[PDB]
Design a protein around this ligand. Structure first.
Ligand SMILES: [Cl-]
Length: 132
């Protein structure tokens, strides 16, 4: 019931201790230039970027994917972020503390602040994308 690309996004953002591999990130960036795949990718990231609490790994890993797409993927990836900028901005406020009382949300807030800064700086974004 999944397309190839959907399987790839699901694995890249799974609730586990792995970080998205460069191979998978590059696959997603390349596939984002195909409009059918682009929409499949973003729909899955939308779901997982909007997760919370003990499922924070879905959020963290989706933010990793999203940053990579903004830098290396199609222009459509940038367009999506600007449409959905409010949601990305809210991730700067993401909260979750684990059983040990450790703040698992901090990594998400840091990632989100860095992505918001990049998206707010058109020239820097365009320069990075051009060099990539
Ligand atoms: Cl397929």
């Amino acid at each position: 019931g999944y397309s190839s690309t959907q399987v790839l996004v699901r694995d890249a953002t799974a609730n586990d201790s792995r970080t998205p591999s460069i191979d998978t990130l590059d696959d997603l960036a390349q596939r984002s230039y195909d409009s059918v795949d682009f929409f499949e990718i973003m729909d899955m990231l939308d779901k997982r970027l909007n997760d919370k609490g003990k499922y924070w790994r879905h959020v963290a890993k989706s933010l990793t994917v999203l940053d990579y797409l903004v830098r290396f993927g199609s222009e459509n990836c940038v367009l999506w972020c600007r449409e959905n900028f409010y949601v990305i901005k809210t991730l700067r406020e993401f909260r979750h503390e684990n059983e040990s009382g450790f703040d698992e949300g901090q990594i998400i807030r840091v990632k989100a602040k860095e992505l918001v800064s990049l998206l707010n700086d058109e020239e820097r974004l365009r320069e990075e994308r051009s060099m990539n």
